[PDB]
Structure to design on (593 residues):
């Protein structure tokens, strides 16, 4: 029916060098994701520090992702959202112009639209492009919730809206969504509960942990999609300690720390207001990493 | 320190035919000045900062500065961002265009750590020489500026003189002023204006004052003179309107009330904000009839 983008996906960190996007590191990281079974990559989402990138840096990250996935089956689901509808429409059109296969569009943050407003927000975005649109609910960061009813109405009313990324630690809501609209693509945005979401019929993940451990997240998701739930849970359980420690400080502070500790990025750099973890949490991230096998390039 | 305190208004931004109604905007500010308000906050949360262009942000601050000249009324410009580089540029822009100080909201959405918030605000304060009021509203931003961070920033940065609190947490208000009694605690929560003032807060940055500027100004002034019996009377009388103004997300109710009072021409928002439900529209209309609303 609808065009979809599902499976194992990575919310890419954006590496910085001397305060600039390391464009070589970025392309190299994406290649490493492709080679470890990932099905799609998400440039400039939350994990990519979308908030602190200039518009040209946003274009650059998206274009590099498109260019690096050419010749592969891996799709580019571009972070393209904003708490201003006029801007979100513009960011959607631009992501499409630069070759993105679809867009991930975060619910408006800070200004707390009502459900009616969220509906009109996403309807305007979806009308402005002809590529798939994945809603993105993360109430702990936005201060609002796209309700089940709103999500289901948007899925049914707008042809290119095909599912939602849930980062709301609410398995009840995941049941609610797929019990009333089994045709939508529920996507886990919370690594520690990837398996519970997939086993209730979710069709993919947009992962933080896959930045560090893409082969494990790929295998988990693919097992689950193959209905080999036993093997998916085994990996989900193994990943629990790292899944949780990657949120000991606000994402992406721990994941960038882990990537640096693993030698996968050259510098532990953020853009303010993000900064390096405390010494104690730095030490905890390094401790948890010890029992995982981290792929190189 | 240099401070901006007293009774202050988070100005709504009126729209007409999709554009900032610039004449309405100046007229609304004049009405605030004429009803005892001590400062105006253009382009904060209540003014829908998130959906204004950089040019409209500029126009709004410039109209505020120009309308307040030759009066005591100060311009405490909304100027914050979840990107530190952009918050610094917004702070510089506000100063260079004549604002008396800035209100800078805690970074929303990307949830910086307390170290991150310290460095964020330290960067902003070092960029201008005008007063900076922090703004804590965890229900909208997803983060909380802790008491220790607020106190550290106040003691380490000359321009930082207090915090607008919109967190429903009177324990924290006590914590702040018991450990750092020199800061200016500013109520960002109309319903508890008097409790914050009576614990030593020195002003309000009000939503309700858009509609009832004389009442909020009296409340504040009674309280600052330690006429607490009178300030509590107004706070109690205002509770019903203070609460109904958040039956939907601010500023959807206050704009609806201003429109119903004939104070703005059109009930227009920028998406993702929009008109209230029919029921909430009716409820706003009913609560307003208990209050005397000053015209122009
Ligand atoms: Mg963003
Ligand atoms: Mg914006
Ligand atoms: Mg007196
Ligand atoms: Mg007395
Ligand atoms: Mg009352």
């Amino acid at each position: 029916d609808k065009n979809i983008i599902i499976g194992a996906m990575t919310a890419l960190i954006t590496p910085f060098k001397n305060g600039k996007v390391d464009e070589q590191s970025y392309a190299r990281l994406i290649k490493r994701q492709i080679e470890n079974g990932i099905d799609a990559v998400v440039p400039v989402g939350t994990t990519g520090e979308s908030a602190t990138l200039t518009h040209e840096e946003n274009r650059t990250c998206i274009e590099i992702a498109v260019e690096t996935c050419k010749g592969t089956k891996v799709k580019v689901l571009a972070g393209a959202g904003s708490n201003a509808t006029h801007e979100a429409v513009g960011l959607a059109k631009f992501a499409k112009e630069h070759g993105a296969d679809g867009i991930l569009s975060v619910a408006p943050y800070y200004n707390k639209p009502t459900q009616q407003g969220l509906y009109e927000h996403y309807k305007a975005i979806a009308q402005s492009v002809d590529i798939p649109v994945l809603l993105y609910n993360v109430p702990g960061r936005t201060g609002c919730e796209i309700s089940t009813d709103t999500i289901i109405k948007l899925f049914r009313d707008c042809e290119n809206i095909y599912g939602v990324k849930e980062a709301s630690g609410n398995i009840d809501k995941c049941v609610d969504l797929l019990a009333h609209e089994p045709r939508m693509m529920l996507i886990s945005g919370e690594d520690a509960i990837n398996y519970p979401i997939l086993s209730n019929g979710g069709k993919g993940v947009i992962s933080v942990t896959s930045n560090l451990l893409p082969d494990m997240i790929s295998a988990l998701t693919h097992f689950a999609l193959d209905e080999n739930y036993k093997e998916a849970k085994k990996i989900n359980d193994e990943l629990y300690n790292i899944n949780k420690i990657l949120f000991c400080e606000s994402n992406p502070i721990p994941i960038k720390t882990a990537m640096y500790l693993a030698g996968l990025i050259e510098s532990l750099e953020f853009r303010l207001p993000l900064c390096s973890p405390s010494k104690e949490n730095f030490a905890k991230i390094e401790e948890v990493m010890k029992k995982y096998k981290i792929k190189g390039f």
